[PDB]
Design a protein around this ligand. Structure first.
Ligand SMILES: *[C@@H]1O[C@H](CO)[C@@H](O[C@@H]2O[C@H](CO)[C@@H](O)[C@H](O)[C@H]2NC(C)=O)[C@H](O)[C@H]1NC(C)=O
Ligand SMILES: *[C@@H]1O[C@H](CO)[C@@H](O)[C@H](O)[C@H]1NC(C)=O
Ligand SMILES: *[C@@H]1O[C@H](CO)[C@@H](O)[C@H](O)[C@H]1NC(C)=O
Lengths: 49, 66
């Protein structure tokens, strides 16, 4: 549900869209994630491992 | 995530793309306010060949008809 359950009722949302909005929250638009999804996922998996 | 009109992608300027059961609108993230998808509310970026989950739809041009 992202951060939407921290204010009222939890609202479902796909994870890629939530990640895109988090990226947009720091000044980088959505197309970066929407074209580098695989690379970002691989980097996140490597870091968490 | 995006709209593929004619060999191009179309991402929302601000808001999410929604559809009730037949037509696509773009709306805010805190209040249901559907709007007609035109070139003013979307910005083109890409080629529509790498995005996953893109539907086609038909965008609207507010200048050519007039
Ligand atoms: C990513 O998730 C997958 C599950 O979908 C993990 O796959 C298995 O995980 C177990 C537990 O560590 C391993 O023993 C298996 O060898 C994994 N199999 C495969 C085919 O990957 C995977 O480990 C997860 N990746 C990381 C880095 O945790
Ligand atoms: C969905 O929205 C369109 C927008 O024109 C409307 O015509 C239609 O009645 C709505 N409902 C359904 C079930 O399509
Ligand atoms: C969008 O249109 C193209 C050609 O007009 C077609 O090849 C493609 O399959 C369409 N998209 C979907 C999701 O059907």
């Amino acid at each position: 549900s992202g951060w939407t359950f921290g204010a009222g009722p939890a609202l479902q949302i796909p994870f890629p869209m939530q990640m895109a909005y988090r990226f947009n929250g720091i000044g980088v638009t959505q197309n970066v994630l929407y074209e580098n999804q695989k690379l970002i996922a691989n980097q996140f998996n490597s870091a968490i491992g | 995530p995006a709209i593929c009109h004619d060999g191009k992608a179309h991402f929302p300027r601000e808001g999410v793309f929604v559809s009730n059961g037949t037509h696509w609108f773009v709306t805010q993230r805190n209040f249901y306010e559907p709007q007609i998808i035109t070139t003013d509310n979307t910005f083109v970026s890409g080629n529509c060949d790498v995005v996953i989950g893109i539907v086609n739809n038909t965008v609207y041009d507010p200048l050519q008809p007039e």
